[PDB]
Amino acid sequence: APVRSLNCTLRDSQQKSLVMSGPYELKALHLQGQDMEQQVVFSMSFVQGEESNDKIPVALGLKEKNLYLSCVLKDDKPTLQLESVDPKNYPKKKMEKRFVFNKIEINNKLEFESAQFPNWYISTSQAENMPVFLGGTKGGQDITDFTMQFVS
Ligand SMILES: CCNC(=O)CN1C[C@@H](C)OC[C@@H]1C
């Protein structure tokens, strides 16, 4: 059948929202009120991959954009990028592995592990206005926990 998707927003566990902040870049900042319309709406697709009760493979597309979060080696390091695709072909159930995140539910929060790069996570910094990135530990000063808000 088709691939199933849900519209949503994400907030880090410090309650920073995510906004597109220039060509193919996502930043996290504290937002409330009118400025919250700026937050990124994701289309979260439920994709093919290894699955368990609390570990669900997803792709994170930007709503009504041919842009996906993806994990690739850059200058020899696992990194997070926004990657454009052929809009005729996406989303699909069998997403390429660089687009797949394991959405892990622990203690009423979510982590998004790279399926391609085990133990690398979608991360934010403590400081405001810094990039969303792929971070190689769910332990230390960087934030790897999120909450999801369902959007109409
Ligand atoms: C710099 C380009 N920014 C936008 O088009 C803003 N929108 C992007 C969309 C994925 O999430 C909702 C948000 C309102």
Overview of the structural elements:
- It comes from Homo sapiens.
- This is Interleukin-1 beta.
- A motif (Involved in interaction with TMED10 C-terminus) lies at residues 112-125.
- Belongs to the IL-1 family.
- The protein is mainly β and 152 residues long.
- It has strands at residues 4-12, 17-20, 26-29, 42-46, 55-62, 67-74, 77-84, 100-106, 109-114, 121-123, 130-131, 133-135, 146-150.
- The chain has a single domain, classed as Trefoil (Acidic Fibroblast Growth Factor, subunit A).
- The chain is built from no helices and 13 strands.
- Residues 20, 40-41, 62-63, 65 line the site of the ligand CCNC(=O)CN1C[C@@H](C)OC[C@@H]1C.
How far is the first residue's CA from the last residue's CA? Answer: 22 Å
CATH topology tier name:
Trefoil (Acidic Fibroblast Growth Factor, subunit A)
Q: SS-based structural class? A: mainly beta
Residues in helix, %: under 10%
Bound molecules: the ligand CCNC(=O)CN1C[C@@H](C)OC[C@@H]1C
- The total strand number stands at 13
PDB class: signaling protein
Keywords: IL-1 beta, Signaling Protein, SGC - Diamond I04-1 fragment screening, PanDDA, XChemExplorer
Assembly: monomeric
Entry title: PanDDA analysis group deposition INTERLEUKIN-1 BETA -- Fragment Z355728146 in complex with INTERLEUKIN-1 BETA
